[PDB]
């Protein structure tokens, strides 16, 4: 029950794996270009922004965040996004965040 997503430091979806349709309902074309914060519960938006800003400072370590994502079926799904920044060591291009997004329980 998971999909891979690639983001810019701002949180914009720059790559989405097709398994997102099962997970949240949207086709990859409906998420690309959009920011991940746009699909987030208003109570979790700041936390998700602070996690994206901190995962940059953590030198490639994994940082996990739990938040509510509005699915295409108009439901708040509990997501666990595990993320890390990747920078190709042969270059000095800006780092991009790589995420694993899974629908988990809050019990």
């Amino acid at each position: 029950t998971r999909f891979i997503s690639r983001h810019n430091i701002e949180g914009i979806f720059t790559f989405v794996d097709h398994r997102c349709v099962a997970t949240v309902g949207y086709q990859p074309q409906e998420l690309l270009g959009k920011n991940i914060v746009e699909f987030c519960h208003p109570e979790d938006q700041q936390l998700l922004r602070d996690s994206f800003q901190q995962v940059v400072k953590l030198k490639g370590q994994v940082l996990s965040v739990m938040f509510r994502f509005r699915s295409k079926n108009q439901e708040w799904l509990w997501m666990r996004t595990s993320s890390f920044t990747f920078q190709n060591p042969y270059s000095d291009e800006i780092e991009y965040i790589i995420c694993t997004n899974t629908n988990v329980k809050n019990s």
Partner: protein, 110 residues
Amino acid sequence: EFKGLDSKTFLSEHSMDMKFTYCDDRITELIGYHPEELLGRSAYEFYHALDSENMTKSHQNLCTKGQVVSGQYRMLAKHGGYVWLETQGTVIYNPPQCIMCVNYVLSEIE
């Protein structure tokens, strides 16, 4: 004219036994494989014989450390030959669920 570093970078996902559970469509332009023909197969089946022991050590390290950077290694291409790769591997645990791989083909492509 050749491909750049981003164009030669693909993502792959594996279960803890090295099996492919996901691969980015970009691997077709680089190595020739199709993500569906890799699913269920072990990553180990693709390493060059001379790079086998090093990748075993990298996997053992990855399992204990949580993240690893492989050395330069060779992967068998679809129509014979071997390309040189360098991968950054990261284990996704449940605070192990899977291994995420950011793979970069060092070899000169297109």
